[PDB]
């Protein structure tokens, strides 16, 4: 189990940090896994998501619905995806709230920073894989 | 004997393992600083003063000037090689002087000295 004295197992502190984390930590928490073809194409398991990712749903009442991410509401720990909407009493469509942990990435909005992130994670992975192997 | 405020002047010992590990870390830090040297300086063999403990012997504060001279270790160089020196103590007996000389000679025979820079 935990050995490093810096880490704490206190549920109180853990919940306080989770519910009062700043936006970058919220992004890190709302990282999401990549699909299969993506995983065998990039050698990465999960990266934080953005507003331009085509995503597929694997959990919830709207399972197997595909669309592009509309927004990432960091304050409520939720993401808004296209075409997954509910109607209010008046009939106006509000996008239904779904979690990054309950969605899986199908396509990446690739820029310089994203390519750098995947390169760093991958390179670490084969580094440690080779270290274990030989 | 509880006439006074032992409530305001009671102090506990819940930090005993903490102080023990702190002392161990402190002596380990001293060892890390003086990595090849021993942690504690050599000390002479002295006798307990009182009549109740005459036959028993213990460790002193530092070696006598006459003992150092007999052992052939300079006064100014002994503290640099780790020998405690006590200017206040006097020998007053050939038995104790010889015992401390033998101890210092054993220290010399077991000591390795490195050549400055």
């Amino acid at each position: 189990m935990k050995v490093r004295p810096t880490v704490s197992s206190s549920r109180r502190k853990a919940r306080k940090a989770h519910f009062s984390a700043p936006s970058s930590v919220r992004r890190v928490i709302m990282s999401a896994p990549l699909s299969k073809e993506l995983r065998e194409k990039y050698n990465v398991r999960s990266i934080p998501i953005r507003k331009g990712d085509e995503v597929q749903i694997v959990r919830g009442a709207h399972k197997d619905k595909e669309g592009k991410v509309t927004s990432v509401y960091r304050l409520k720990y939720v993401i808004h995806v296209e075409r997954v909407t509910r109607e209010k009493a008046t009939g106006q469509t509000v996008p239904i709230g779904i979690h990054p942990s309950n969605v899986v990435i199908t396509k990446l909005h690739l820029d310089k920073d994203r390519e750098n992130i995947l390169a760093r994670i991958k390179a670490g992975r084969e580094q440690v894989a080779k270290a274990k192997g030989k | 004997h509880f006439r006074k405020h032992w409530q305001r002047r009671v102090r506990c010992h819940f930090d005993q393992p903490g102080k023990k590990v702190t002392r161990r870390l402190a002596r380990r830090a001293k060892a890390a600083a003086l990595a090849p040297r021993p942690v504690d300086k050599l000390r002479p063999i002295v006798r307990c003063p009182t009549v109740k403990y005459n036959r028993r012997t213990r460790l002193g504060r530092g070696f006598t000037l006459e003992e150092l001279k007999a052992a052939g270790i300079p006064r100014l160089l002994a503290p640099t090689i780790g020998i405690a020196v006590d200017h206040r103590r006097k020998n007053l007996s050939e038995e104790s002087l010889a015992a401390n000389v033998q101890r210092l000679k054993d220290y010399k025979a077991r000591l390795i000295l490195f050549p400055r820079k």
Binding site: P5, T6 | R24, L25, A26, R27, R28, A29, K30, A31, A32, A33, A35, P36, P38, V39, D40, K41, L42, R43, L59, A70, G72, I73, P74, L76, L77, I81, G82, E94, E95, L97, A98, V101, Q102, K105, K108, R110, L111, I112, L113, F114, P115, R116
Partner: protein
């Protein structure tokens, strides 16, 4: 208390401090002890492996098994038995074992650069003139006043000349 609660309420970051200690817990450097030191082991065990004595004082408690880290005269004086008016005072003349111990022994027994001290140009010139005038008579060079203002002893002059090289 109110100060802690104000830190609770304020939207100011908590200034977490790093675990910084005054003294390093392990030795560091390109020396034998630092290279062969084992971080996980304790001081006593490390000194057992090195082959050196950690504490010169009396053992204050039970030790680990096999550590070895903690430790005719006509005139009747025991000092004649113990013996093997000036002594060398800047150094001591000293007369199947761990690798660290042998490495330290080799390092101790390695020869060292002499770095021989030499003499100044004016001292050389003064000695040269004194030799030129008085030949090799130590008494005469001590007797002289003009060439020898600092009334150094003849033996002093002789050893300076010997160190310089010329008789």
């Amino acid at each position: 208390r109110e100060l802690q609660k104000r830190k609770r309420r304020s939207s100011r970051p908590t200034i977490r401090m790093p675990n910084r200690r005054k003294k390093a817990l392990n030795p560091a450097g390109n020396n034998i002890i630092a290279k062969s030191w084992n971080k996980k082991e304790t001081l006593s065990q490390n000194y057992t492996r090195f082959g050196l004595v950690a504490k010169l004082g009396k053992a204050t408690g039970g030790t680990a098994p096999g550590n070895k880290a903690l430790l005719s005269e006509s005139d009747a004086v025991p000092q004649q038995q113990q013996q093997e008016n000036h002594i060398r005072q800047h150094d001591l003349e000293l007369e199947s074992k761990p690798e660290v111990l042998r490495a330290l022994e080799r390092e101790a027994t390695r020869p060292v650069e002499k770095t021989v001290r030499h003499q100044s140009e004016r001292e050389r010139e003064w000695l040269q003139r004194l030799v030129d005038k008085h030949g090799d008579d130590v008494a005469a060079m001590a007797r002289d006043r003009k060439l020898n203002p600092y009334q150094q002893t003849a033996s002093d002059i002789k050893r300076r000349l010997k160190k310089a090289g010329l008789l």
